[PDB]
Design a protein around this nucleic acid. Structure first.
Ligand SMILES: [Mg+2]
Ligand SMILES: [Mg+2]
Ligand SMILES: [Mg+2]
Ligand SMILES: [Mg+2]
Ligand SMILES: [Mg+2]
Ligand SMILES: [Mg+2]
Ligand SMILES: [Mg+2]
Ligand SMILES: [Mg+2]
Ligand SMILES: [Mg+2]
Ligand SMILES: [Mg+2]
Ligand SMILES: [Mg+2]
Ligand SMILES: [Mg+2]
Length: 70
RNA sequence: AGAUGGUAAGGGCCCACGGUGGAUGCCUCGGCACCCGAGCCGAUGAAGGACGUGGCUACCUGCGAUAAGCCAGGGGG
């Protein structure tokens, strides 16, 4: 993911609420599974997508945590 | 009658070249000594581990299902 896309992701996430954050991680955790399944049958040439999504989820949960922390 | 040399299955000494082996010199990622600096960690779960963790990953390192990494400040270019 591009550095600017990352800022973008953070700014956008930070605007979200916990519930909206949870909904979105679940969606991404789902989108990762598809990637996995594709990676395992040799149909994911674009494999950087996996490291990417995984960190998105991390960023998101990180931010979810931010919110709930105080 | 007499007398003496070429035999090398193999062996010995010497010379040349190799093989084996890893001495010696040079080298140093490491070690050693002293001196200075610094000196506690832990239920907010330590020390130290187990198992995991990479698109493909045996091991080591790093890391913990947010898993060779997440957020932010500073540094740097
Ligand atoms: Mg990042
Ligand atoms: Mg004779
Ligand atoms: Mg002879
Ligand atoms: Mg012979
Ligand atoms: Mg002899
Ligand atoms: Mg020789
Ligand atoms: Mg010398
Ligand atoms: Mg100490
Ligand atoms: Mg430990
Ligand atoms: Mg390990
Ligand atoms: Mg930083
Ligand atoms: Mg910076």
């Amino acid at each position: 993911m591009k550095l600017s896309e990352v800022r973008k992701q953070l700014e956008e996430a930070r605007k979200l609420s916990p519930v909206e954050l949870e909904k979105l991680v679940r969606e991404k955790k789902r989108e990762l599974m598809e990637l996995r399944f594709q990676a395992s049958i040799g149909q994911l040439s674009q494999n950087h997508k996996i490291r990417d999504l995984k960190r998105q989820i991390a960023r998101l949960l990180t931010v979810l945590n931010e919110k709930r922390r105080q």
